[PDB]
From a paper:
WT LlGH31_u1 was crystallized in two different crystal forms (named, crystal forms 1 and 2, see Experimental procedures). Crystal forms 1 and 2 belong to the space groups P21 and P6322, respectively, and comprise six and one molecule of LlGH31_u1, respectively, in an asymmetric unit. The P21 and P6322 structures of unliganded WT (named WT_P21 and WT_P6322, respectively) were determined at 1.75- and 1.85-Å resolutions. Despite the space group difference, hexamer formation could be generated via the symmetry operations in the P6322 space group, and the hexamer assembly is isomorphous with six monomers in WT_P21. With molecular assembly in the crystal structures, LlGH31_u1 probably forms a hexamer. We performed a structural similarity search on the DALI server using WT_P6322 as a query. However, the superimposition of D394A-Koj2 with WT_P6322 shows that the estimated distance between the Asp394 and 1-OH of kojibiose was 1.2 Å, indicating a steric hindrance.
Numbering used by the authors:
A (entry chain A), B (entry chain A): 11 to 739
The structure:
Amino acid sequence: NNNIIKFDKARFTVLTEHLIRIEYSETGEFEERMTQMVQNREFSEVNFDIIEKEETIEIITSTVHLYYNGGEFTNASLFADVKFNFSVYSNRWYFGEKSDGNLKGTTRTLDMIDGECPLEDGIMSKNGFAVLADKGKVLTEVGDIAGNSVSTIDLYLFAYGRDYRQALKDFYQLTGNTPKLPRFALGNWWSRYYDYSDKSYLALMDKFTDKKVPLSVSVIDMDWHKVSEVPSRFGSGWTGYSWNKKLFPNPENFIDELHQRKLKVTLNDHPADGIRAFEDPYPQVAQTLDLNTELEEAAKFDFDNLKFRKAYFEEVHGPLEKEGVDFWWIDWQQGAISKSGVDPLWLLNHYQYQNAQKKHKNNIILSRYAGPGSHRYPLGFSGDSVISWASLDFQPYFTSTASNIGYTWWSHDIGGHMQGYKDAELSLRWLQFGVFSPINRLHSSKSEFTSKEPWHFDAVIEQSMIDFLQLRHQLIPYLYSANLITASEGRALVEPLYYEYPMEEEAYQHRNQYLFGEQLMVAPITEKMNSLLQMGSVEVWFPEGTWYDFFSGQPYDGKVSLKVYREITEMPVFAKAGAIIPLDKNPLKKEEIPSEIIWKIFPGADGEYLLLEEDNETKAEFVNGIFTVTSKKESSRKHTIIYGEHEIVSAKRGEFSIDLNGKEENFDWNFSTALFRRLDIAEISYEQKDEILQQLSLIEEHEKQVAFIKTNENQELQNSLFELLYSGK
Amino acid sequence: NNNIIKFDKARFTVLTEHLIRIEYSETGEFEERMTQMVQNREFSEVNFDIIEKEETIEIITSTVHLYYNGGEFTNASLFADVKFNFSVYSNRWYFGEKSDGNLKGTTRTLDMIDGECPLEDGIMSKNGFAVLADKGKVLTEVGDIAGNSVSTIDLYLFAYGRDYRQALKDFYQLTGNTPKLPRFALGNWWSRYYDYSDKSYLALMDKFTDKKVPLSVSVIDMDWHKVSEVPSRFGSGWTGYSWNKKLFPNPENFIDELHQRKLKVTLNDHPADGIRAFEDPYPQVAQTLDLNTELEEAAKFDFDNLKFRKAYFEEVHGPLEKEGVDFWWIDWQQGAISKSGVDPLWLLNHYQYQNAQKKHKNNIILSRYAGPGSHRYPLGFSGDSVISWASLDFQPYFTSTASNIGYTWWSHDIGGHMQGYKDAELSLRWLQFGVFSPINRLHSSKSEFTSKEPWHFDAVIEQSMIDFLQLRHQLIPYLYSANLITASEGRALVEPLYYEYPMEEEAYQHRNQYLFGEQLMVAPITEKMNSLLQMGSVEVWFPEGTWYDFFSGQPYDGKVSLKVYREITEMPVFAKAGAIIPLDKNPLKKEEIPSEIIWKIFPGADGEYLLLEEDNETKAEFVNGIFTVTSKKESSRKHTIIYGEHEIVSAKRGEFSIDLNGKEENFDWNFSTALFRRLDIAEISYEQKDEILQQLSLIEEHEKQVAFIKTNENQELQNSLFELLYSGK
């Protein structure tokens, strides 16, 4: 290509104006094969300039000067200046050195993490550049490990400035797009490390139905297989591939019952102790792998070994798949050691994801993060988080930041995995976040005390959990459409604020705040409520424009940073004037695609929404007060229209256009009602409640209502009252 | 041997079913010579299985699968699975990696340690396996350093599960048994970093006698030699080999006076500055080592050098030994550097222990820990601990954990060495521990304020210290018998609870609690007393069975974890029903072996005790209430029998049998007396004392006495009263 330049023992490939591959080869041969990370180096031709001398080369694009002075790559011989002024003297990359500015990415797991842990770098930087080292093995054409690259140094310099979305799109072009998820992945999952029987698991699935909680996925954790029944001469029962016949006497019939309830079924797989001589598949595996059965030779876990992988997929998983297991939960915690030097977690996710496509279209796994490019193998499984306010407070930041290395389908144990402390409000706050996260999978530890069942809790917590779990299914149309946008356009469902607002300092100062698809902005509450107010709070940054609480219609004039207060049953989620959000009208109804969609419109601006589905595209447009719905293909689907407060049209078939210029724009939300409710629940003096209600009702001028609350001795009560006055301004 | 297998460049030796040597050699030659650590690889033949293929080998014993995949040893090529289920996924050893579970061992020294310090691994693990790397030099047949092993990797995989005592016995078979100590080592030692004269040292030894404190050892610290009198051109006076003639004008006569008092004598040796030209032995050493005397060439410390070692033993130590020095206190603090790569501390302990056997049978040194196998050179000397409650609180755990690397004769500075803070109760608690430790050596810093003399303190502390110092000499028969059991059977005097109770979780949760020989269980108090109770406390785990306070007879029904309270003058030490403890009846009487033994019997079960002595074995048996004493050889020894409370037989000669079925089984200890004493000393309100005494006397039902104390506002007083109610149940 004209986009390739060789100099001394180095090779430079200008992939985009903002992305340069940098290689070193001792042997004069450079690597064309794919790697664990890189799937594609075919990019459209771009313009750049070169200054090539006897001893030095300079490559010049719109955004970077890359310099190479010959010899081995050192911090002195290989370095780059960006053509940006985001910093005073952090604008230079030096080979092998770290600079300030990296917005971070993700890490393997939250196992044993109570609150924060360190993250790896991503490709996004406030200073406009990042280097992504390719240290992986080469692949063959069909995707097996081929050994060591002949490019013994192979780097990708990203110099996208603060065009983070383009950086991520081009990262997906280099490393491969995220595959499409199946719609079932986006519903509620039930999971618990608990020794259910077939009977008690079905009873619980039937109780969810009776309780009006919709589920898409039934997880069965490790007590599906033998555990205490494993003789100790074999080691533990952590790894298992044999049903516990007491609990599951007829596994296929049990899985058939979950399938009749329209559930997908996954089993926990702890692979590290392989297939030992007590296991039901051991005689077949022993025959295939020529094991010494009289010395009970184990088929040890070895995902570098083609014959082992084949026996694992065909003879260990295969029989369980025939019984109706839909996909695999790979729960790998036993380290990064293999003879090849490839992390066994990477070998599991890569080969198991590929194997899962044989039985079902667009199938998934559930496994931990295996490094850059491992987004090709959804879903992410963060693991054994400690049950704490601190863990919840980290998790939104964790989730949105992961988009910076393209890993956009994290599934967290909703409510936390293990250890930690009981607090029903923590459980409820965690579920609110989970509903507005990539995947909503309830899971817990082996404790008798950690079930995430809503009815574990009091009547208030129970009803709120059921409400949010129903909301998750209402959101599946929006989630599935965003999923197809991830797969086709390389846009994350969960974005940090700085993707949309890269030049706004406040977009970097609200770590737990994020965009959720294109129409919603979420600010989860991740701190225990103030008992004096009976409300939790978070500081929300409202960008320029008019924003509405998604639930209440409470309005906010951006741009402003404002502390917002919500009761434990309520979550801060916001939509702009002109937002159009589809919702399943029948979230409890078992059906492949919604028979009815609610179009929820926020007045005050034009807008539009494209609902992508398996077999259709439906465009909702709101222009000069006219709402129009059209689709590629016709269907019997019935559309409901909600304009602000009011249901305008109920269950109307086919394409149509309705004029909403006539209709009531304003939500009911009003200062006086909200004021009365905040004062009423507060655990403060009745004399203070009486004085605040009286004075805020009597005082007419907005500035004097604010002066009145400014004298209040309760500082947090001032901030709560200020939120209502700001919304009522 | 059939117990030897070669594969690729590796050699495996199956020493036991649970112990495998693993070697790598580039040259095809493997090491048969002894090392600093390993003295013996002759073990009886054992059965095991092999699966040997073209590219891999598996060795299978009753407890482990060892795998080697060929090539250099890496975490991928060399690894082992244990045949135990003590953990879910910590059952695999990987070459060069650490696993969870190690119960730890010991470290060189407590120099400058205030409380806890990190310890090295031992051979014991809760998960059932440990690797002990042999990184030492090879020895010649006679025990000199021969250079580098030809086994450039040489490892010992221990896979004993929780059979910790067998692991330790087989470690002693590999590394050599601990030698027998001499009986004098087990008595009280006096030491102080203080510039005594011959006259003032003898006066102090005569004051111990007048004060009824028995001593076995007289330590003379570094002010024995010139210190301030050393010209500064030579460096410091820390190293010295020349008597200070002002303080010791006639050293042999002074040592003769200590010998007439039946004391053994040791001098501090700081070896690091060698033999400099001012020293009394320098002219002889200079002649032997061909030094340049007109340039005052020093004989620098060089224990790699055969001629230096010979001149050190014969011409430096030899003259002081002729004056009557019995053994050497090696106080080495000057680092681990030598030309050979052997730690100078190891060279000192190895060669000085060997040299000490020339002048006396079963002689000792006193020196810091020099790594695995250095138990062959007793005694351990932990050094310059900081005087603190924190240091004392670490020391029992430190001492029992050291058994896990076979280093079972730690001598700690009793009361702490230096710095820290005055607290007479800390001094008394420390001496209580020391009496129930491997060695009871009182020692202190150069301060005018840190003497460990009992009469330094008030009359209460003084009497209690004298009482415990007398108890140490009463215990010498028991200690000397345990010493011969260490030397002959490889059983530690001090064991962690988990040696006896490996499957009891509570045996891992009482770090300062230990077995002391086979008949006593000790729970030292290592925290300042609660001034409200005037008592200190420790949580004691009582194993299954009936236990008695060794001192009071207070009973405890196991299994239970119970906080116990003792006045500062009292120590928690416990014996089971059926325990038989010999005691010297005449601890102040200077005599080589006790002329009279008290047999202290705890009623309620059968038992037995074997008293091993220099020239006799005496068996005490208690079966169906009949007490029998027999011996290999006859003697004039007189036996006293104490059955629970009562002296049954006084000063009876020879073999005999007495029936104790007739005699009073029960101790005097009673709830009411103990209750009155705890309330009486407590610094609480008299109204509370009156109400507790009245209500606990009136309320008849045990459950209602416990309910009454459960309402007490003083939580620690509740726990103290609960201990008495539990013992009275």
